[PDB]
Amino acid sequence: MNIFEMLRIDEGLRLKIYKDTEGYYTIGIGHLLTKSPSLNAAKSELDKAIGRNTNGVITKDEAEKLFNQDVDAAVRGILRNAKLKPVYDSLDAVRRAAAINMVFQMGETGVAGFTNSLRMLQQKRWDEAAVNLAKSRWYNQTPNRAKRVITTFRTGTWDAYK
Ligand SMILES: CCOc1ccccc1O
């Protein structure tokens, strides 16, 4: 298991435009196109991302290319964030993957709400962190995914991903 396999499980793979759990146009492996309710606006973003007129469909290779970019961007974003970087650097590699997963799903804006969890994670108070993480809109709206990510933070193992 690694961050690519983990996110592939959590995000799935779809080669045509679809709406994610929040109702936003998405393609591939969790590649958010736009929060606009306009399908045309999403098709434009897709074409811009792929570099051709796609008509709302992409190949597996293209999906994977966007995915690699998205993962890279998530990590690079963490490292450029003065609040996230020190916590990220304090973690082992397994727990780092849990961190990347969260940023991938909700963005740096989304994880901004997690100040108290971040502190407990930097303190390595894993069970406390786990309890605090579940007290969230995130957990309530995507409980099964959140439980997997939380177990990963709690244990520093890949047990939740078999
Ligand atoms: C991972 C998303 O997969 C789908 C979404 C909407 C319709 C069919 C899908 O397989």
Ligand SMILES: CCOc1ccccc1O
């Ligand atoms: C609760 C979110 O956890 C993290 C996110 C980004 C970097 C390090 C983290 O512990």
